[PDB]
Design a binder for this molecule. Structure first.
Ligand SMILES: *Cc1c(COP(=O)(O)O)cnc(C)c1O
Ligand SMILES: *Cc1c(COP(=O)(O)O)cnc(C)c1O
Lengths: 413, 413
């Protein structure tokens, strides 16, 4: 856990922006990669790239063993029962779409309900909007408490015997809320519904055990957990996946192809059409190895300390609003009084500090918060308390700068 | 074009398999990558990885400029009119599925026809099987001539005023046939149909000009053209894409998101849901730069010479059947009399030689050929006449080996 030694493994952190040391606080948008991951990609392309299938030629066997070896690493990492339940996809968004297309569009009829929350990312809203439209079903929202948490009483109220799907984020990328997924799964199941978990913001930062959560589906993205871009995972309980039709069709996912009719491969390959994301999946396996070596519990404890420190330091600033609860993941979404968050991000980037401004792909949540946009600083395993000091110092300077501009302007005119 | 200097750029070629120099003749399954591409990925992750959108922070702007810069490289490379017509996808298979989902399922009714050919890869068969099933339309096949080419008279016969979609490979990955796509497009259009071109095997090997072809849709894969795995392109004429609904939904592809209804971004981003395939797309741009520097006409001429040499040398072998026409792309699919092609591939890999055996994702074509499987050697810009000499020498040895085993066995028993 020596943080200097961790940071030494991430080449991208060692540079300057606008003549200042880079302070990267946008890991919730995408994470940075250690040498172990980057070198895994290089070794792949330098030494054993080939299309998959064993029993053909040597490099082909190496590539296949790498690819399927990564599938097993994923299985172990989330504690799934079987590799049949681990599907490689392009990312969380594609994973959630696959569930909406192959499960929801097949199992919803008029009168059935899909239940989501106001804090969902767009990836876990729009596929369900489309699925309910296609089927004549109903979309419903679980309300939030005043601090941006979900009460289990509101879940019990909203979920009914007509509910077929409950879809929810494990962790919000805006509020930092950790939702009570295990308890929500029980409520879903008691009502005859499945639960679909958007795990994009939880997987990088805390241990996932899908057997303990009892989630029916779980989606994650490589690029948020030190892995390559363009790859993700869909986990689904084997019994559900066995009864779902493929979302995409082509080579690799078939068994027999006739002129008019075809039959599908067994799981997981039923859901993997075309040449797979070979290098990316292998690289994601390397990210998992890297994270496990540090320890996800160790990473969670570091983030708990960074979050506590940030919240305290933000409370030292006058004229700053922080959104969400005290108990949270490693991020802070905020606004400065009388400064647009896009201007905050601009001024901070001039100091080397990378944060994000906008709606963070959660427009319904922005409306619930009664704002159009916010600024967000997000932390990961390579971030330090010194970086949070720099952030809060820069925010104080930003307030002073805009105050002076306002007074200069009012005096003129 | 010095071939030694070209080969020097591909680190993977400089190794031994089973104590023999590697002879990689499976580029039709996947291509190998030059240092220029591999180093592009490394630079990305080492220096400017961030999620996309300009106007936020410095690395974010660099990443976005890289990503959108690659889109323009693609546009130029295939001579599309606009970047609005260039969509990044996971690969050819996903591209073809997107057309089947968003165009075919929206424009087909009972009585309408989708017309394909017996030589199509599964990626360009199964999505249409599913689309016709979903809509009550009819799937029809254009017959092949005796040498595995398509006659334009058969296309005129098969395509009718009820035909809405003609889908065809530019180049067959089994026969090596180059199909007359420009003339087929005219026949499609005259009948009121669109044409969908599977360009996975043409793009790596010959110049593509979509304005000259007049194709409505064109799909390609990065991994076959010296680029990263997990990325491809869908080209579509802007007027068609404007009227098609998205195939996947989420962040990045929206403009406004309400509780129940959402509106979409303009092209091309309408069709790119979620965090994009950032590194892969940038790497594909580097592959395009690399190929353009060598020259695609130069690559086509090299492959024409390799194909001519291979066909001549195969005709020197007794007891070998080659499938397809004399005028062809850079590949040879074949069978040895009385030797299963899987055994051919196994014996060749013991000599360092990588070829592929099976159905090559073209089961209907195997049936048309009256075989269950075949062996395939395929060539690209880093392959030489010496490698073809090694292949034919190994095939002669294979025939002699199996003949001796057969005689040994018959004498015993
Ligand atoms: C490889 C290939 C495909 C499939 O492409 P993927 O990259 O596997 O999606 C489709 N058509 C042809 C002609 C090919 O050679
Ligand atoms: C980033 C994120 C997503 C979207 O994931 P992509 O990798 O962009 O597909 C979904 N949900 C949450 C909670 C996220 O943080």
């Amino acid at each position: 856990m020596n943080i200097t030694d961790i940071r030494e493994q991430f080449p991208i952190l060692h540079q300057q922006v606008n003549g200042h040391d880079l302070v990267y606080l946008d890991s919730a948008a995408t994470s940075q990669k250690p040498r172990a991951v980057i070198e895994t990609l290089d070794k792949y392309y330098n030494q054993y790239n080939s299309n998959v299938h064993r029993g053909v030629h040597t490099l082909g066997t190496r590539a296949t063993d790498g690819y399927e070896g990564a599938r097993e690493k994923v299985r172990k990492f989330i504690n799934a029962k079987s590799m049949a339940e681990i599907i490689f996809t392009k990312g969380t968004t594609t994973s959630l779409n696959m569930v909406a297309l192959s499960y929801a569009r097949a199992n919803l009829k008029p009168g059935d309900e899909v239940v989501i929350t106001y804090m969902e990312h767009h990836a876990n809203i729009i596929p369900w909007q489309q699925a309910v439209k296609a089927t004549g079903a109903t979309l419903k929202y679980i309300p939030l408490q005043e601090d941006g948490t979900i009460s289990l009483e509101d879940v019990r109220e909203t979920v009914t015997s007509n509910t077929k799907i409950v879809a929810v984020s494990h962790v919000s990328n805006v509020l930092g809320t950790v939702n009570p997924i295990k308890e929500m799964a029980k409520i879903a199941h008691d009502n005859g519904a499945v639960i679909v978990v958007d795990g994009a913001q939880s997987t990088p930062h805390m241990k996932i055990d899908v057997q303990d959560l009892d989630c029916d589906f779980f989606a994650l993205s490589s690029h948020k957990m030190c892995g390559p871009t363009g790859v993700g995972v869909l986990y689904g309980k084997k019994a559900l996946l066995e009864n779902m039709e493929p979302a995409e069709f082509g080579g690799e996912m078939i068994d027999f192809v006739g002129l008019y009719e075809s039959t599908w491969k067994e799981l997981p390959w039923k859901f993997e059409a075309g040449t797979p994301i070979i290098a990316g999946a292998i690289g994601l396996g390397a990210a998992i190895d890297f994270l496990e070596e540090i320890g996800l519990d160790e990473i969670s404890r570091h983030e708990h300390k960074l979050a506590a420190y940030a919240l305290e330091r933000f409370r030292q600033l006058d004229g700053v609003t922080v959104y969400g609860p005290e108990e949270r993941a490693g991020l802070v979404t905020f606004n400065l009084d009388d400064v647009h968050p896009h201007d905050v991000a601009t001024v901070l980037d001039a100091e080397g500090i990378a944060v994000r401004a906008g709606h963070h792909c959660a427009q319904p949540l922005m409306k619930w918060l009664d704002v159009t946009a916010t600024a967000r600083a997000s932390f990961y395993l390579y971030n330090t308390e010194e970086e949070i000091d720099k952030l809060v110092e820069a925010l104080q300077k930003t307030k002073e700068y805009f105050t002076n501009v306002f007074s200069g302007h009012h005096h003129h005119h």
